[model samples]
Target: AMFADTAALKAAMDTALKEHPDKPVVLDFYADWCISCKEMAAYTLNQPEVHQAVDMERFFQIDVTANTPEHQALLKEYGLFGPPGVFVVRSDGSRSEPLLGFVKADKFIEWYEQNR
Candidate 1:
């Protein structure tokens, strides 16, 4: 689900995790103006393999450009230090090992499956 704003993202994440405690959480750290981010979202997320591999119910997208203090804090707390960072978090709220930078569909699916 697309969040209306930063606050909504946090609220939805909380609700999703609470409702599906066993599911892994995938957070997409992206900026709207980023060409690479747009390219990856368009090309990677559109792939059949990627769609099949990802748990859409547990997946989330955050626009990093709208840097509210809460948003910044969330990013900092999760160690989301860069744009296009894809984080796979555990049910216990512990973060997966940070996957910095951009990831292609093939590598991302492999990494996520391995981690999951």
Candidate 2:
């Protein structure tokens, strides 16, 4: 399920930080109008190997379709100008360099395995 607002995202992050401080988290940004987002969802996110590489339990999907103030704040907080991007929060709560655009399943898995 996708987080509808920043509050939910923040809550989850805080909880994870407290309960599983050593685990990395994946924050994915997407928008309904973004074609690349759809492509990534269809071709990358759905792959079994990608799922195995990523901890689905720690995955957070941020939908920016509404473009709400909270959503805009999150985008700005991550230094993202738009959707179709991802941020990997390291075990220490630091965010990695943002991965922008539509990444293929294999490339995504490779990056995830290397970083996560």
Candidate 3:
């Protein structure tokens, strides 16, 4: 399931933070017309290494396909314009730098390790 708005995303993070105090929250910005997003999902994040690396995390995908006001708000809030952007919300309530574009599984694991 995808988050529909900022409030929903915030609530989801809050719930994840409360439920899994040791886990970080991962957010993905995606759109239907996003080629890089497809590549990331199919070739990067689906890898076993990446899955294991993110096993202890709470992940959410914000679909901005419609580019509605709520979606645009979410994009602007994340300082992003389109899909394939990744953000890690650490357990300490701090957010790591976004991993934009199509990142390889090896590099994704590296980024997750560095950030999480």
Score each candidate by Cα lDDT: 0.75, 0.83, 0.83
Q: Largest TM-score belongs to which candidate? A: 2
Of 1 and 2, the candidate ahead on lDDT is: 2
Residue-level lDDT tens digits of model 1 in 1-116: 54437778877778888888888878777777667678777777667888899877788888768777866887787776546577787778776775665567898798888888
Worst 10 residues of 3 by lDDT: 49-58
Give model 3's TM-score versus the native structure. Answer: 0.88
Q: State the TM-score for model 1.
A: 0.82
Where model 3 places Cα greater than 4 Å from the true spot, the runs are none
Candidate 3 lDDT over residue span 2-116, tens digit each: 7767688888888998888787889999888999889998998778887787863478888889889988877887888777689998668788889888878888889888986
Q: After superposition, how far is residue 62 of candidate 3 from its true place, in Å?
A: 0.7
Ranking of all candidate structures by their lDDT, best first: 2, 3, 1
Question: Where is the poorest 10-residue window by lDDT in model 2?
Answer: 90-99
Clashing pairs in 2: none
